[PDB]
Amino acid sequence: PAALKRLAKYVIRGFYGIEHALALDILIRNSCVKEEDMLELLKFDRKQLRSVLNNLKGDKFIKCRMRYFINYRTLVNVVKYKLDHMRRRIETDERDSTNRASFKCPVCSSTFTDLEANQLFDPMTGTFRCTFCHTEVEEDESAMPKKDARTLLARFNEQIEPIYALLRETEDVNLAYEI
Amino acid sequence: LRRNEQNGAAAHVIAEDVKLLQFHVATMVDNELPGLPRAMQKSGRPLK
Amino acid sequence: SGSSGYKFGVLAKIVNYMKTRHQRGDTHPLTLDEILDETQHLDIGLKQKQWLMTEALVNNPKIEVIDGKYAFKPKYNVRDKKALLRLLDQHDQRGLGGILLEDIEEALPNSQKAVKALGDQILFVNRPDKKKILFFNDKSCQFSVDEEFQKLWRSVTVDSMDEEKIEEYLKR
Amino acid sequence: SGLELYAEWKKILLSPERVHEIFKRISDEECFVLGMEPR
Ligand SMILES: [Zn+2]
């Protein structure tokens, strides 16, 4: 799994913090991974090492072993889980809201929806009359741009995938090898 | 809690704050629960 | 007071002086009598000088004597201040646990070192602000991207299991 | 204990988010079996 170790090195820099990534680099070497040996190589405090280990235990990166000496090996399976959560975020970002041009006077700052517009409209004036004040409900325009936001959010999320595409492809090749 | 979670805290503080949030919401619904010590705003006055 | 000679702490001061001249950058082999003349402790008395050589110098745990002249107890290694990049290149030793406390005394001020460190590829990560210093290289491979923590923030399931199975079902 | 429930088969604290997710997974028919009408 030398190729998997190279993929792990790229992911640890990308997702884990720099302090965590250095600890993960010690984990990548499996010849000796005692808790005391890992602490000495890190040069961090035992309490600081324990805090890093607790985050790794939540990540499922490390598995506790009895020897007492504790042996740590790379068992993380949430790299795909984090990538899929990011993919769900991309789908959520594209799926925001519609146009729904809300008639709203910025003077009274009251967003009346396109449904509430018929009540705003007054026949004698002939224009959507701002009910709260006496002006004309103005179009939302730049304010509350849910329709504008979804396209921009989708574009930013789409940009992230090509940078991570090489790592995702390597993970897919590893998954094909696993069967 | 929301701003600290958005920033990305070590989570040691987050574990303490979420329990305090649980205590605050539980205190509002029930004050007769065993544990859940009564909170006094001022002048030794019990909350309702 | 156990065993002491003349003014208290004179032996520890002599070891500190040996370190100080090396940090100054003026390096010369010094005999115990030569150190006494340099520190103006030459008239410490014959008995006190004999006591320092026979017991006080031997007592120090990390003291090293090359041959005729003693060497500074705190740092056996020379303060070269060079080949730090080579130490960084091997991440197995993590730069041999290099500390900024050891640096800044070898031959350069902290202000010059801070400018040099930022310009150089070598970067310093300190878990404690002043207690410990370490040198690491993260490279340019790491990518901030967009909302990288926020995607992790969405995944707050943590210990709970089968969340990935739901994502796999959506992927199908 | 006081405000938090811990499960020991290793007495990990229970997660309310985890319990809520399990409740959504729980079938309506089994929920009726334990005496809660689902609707
Ligand atoms: Zn108005």
Swiss-Prot record, chain A:
The protein's assembly and partners: Tetramer of two alpha and two beta chains. Interacts with TAF6/TAFII80. Interacts with ATF7IP. Interacts with SND1. Part of TBP-based Pol II pre-initiation complex (PIC), in which Pol II core assembles with general transcription factors and other specific initiation factors including GTF2E1, GTF2E2, GTF2F1, GTF2F2, TCEA1, ERCC2, ERCC3, GTF2H2, GTF2H3, GTF2H4, GTF2H5, GTF2A1, GTF2A2, GTF2B and TBP; this large multi-subunit PIC complex mediates DNA unwinding and targets Pol II core to the transcription start site where the first phosphodiester bond forms.
Protein name, entry field: General transcription factor IIE subunit 1
Record-annotated HTH TFE/IIEalpha-type domain positions: 4-80
Function (record text): Recruits TFIIH to the initiation complex and stimulates the RNA polymerase II C-terminal domain kinase and DNA-dependent ATPase activities of TFIIH. Both TFIIH and TFIIE are required for promoter clearance by RNA polymerase.
Gene coding for it: GTF2E1
Annotated localization: Nucleus
Protein family (similarity comment): Belongs to the TFIIE alpha subunit family.
N6-acetyllysine: modified positions: 57
Binding site for Zn(2+): 105, 108, 130, 133
Zinc finger (C4-type): 105-133
From Swiss-Prot, chain C:
Organism (species): Homo sapiens (Human)
Family of this protein: Belongs to the TFIIE beta subunit family.
Protein name: Transcription initiation factor IIE subunit beta
Record carries keyword Cell cycle: no
Protein task: Recruits TFIIH to the initiation complex and stimulates the RNA polymerase II C-terminal domain kinase and DNA-dependent ATPase activities of TFIIH. Both TFIIH and TFIIE are required for promoter clearance by RNA polymerase.
Any single GO BP term: transcription by RNA polymerase II
Subunit structure: Tetramer of two alpha and two beta chains. Interacts with FACT subunit SUPT16H. Interacts with ATF7IP. Interacts with SND1. Part of TBP-based Pol II pre-initiation complex (PIC), in which Pol II core assembles with general transcription factors and other specific initiation factors including GTF2E1, GTF2E2, GTF2F1, GTF2F2, TCEA1, ERCC2, ERCC3, GTF2H2, GTF2H3, GTF2H4, GTF2H5, GTF2A1, GTF2A2, GTF2B and TBP; this large multi-subunit PIC complex mediates DNA unwinding and targets Pol II core to the transcription start site where the first phosphodiester bond forms.
Record key words, sorted: Acetylation, Disease variant, DNA-binding, Nucleus, Phosphoprotein, Transcription, Transcription regulation
Record lineage: Eukaryota, Metazoa, Chordata, Craniata, Vertebrata
DNA-binding region: 1-79
Assigned GO CC terms: cytosol; nucleoplasm; transcription factor TFIID complex; transcription factor TFIIE complex
Localization of this protein: Nucleus
Amino-acid biosynthesis among keywords: no
GO molecular function annotations of the record: DNA binding; RNA binding; RNA polymerase II general transcription initiation factor activity
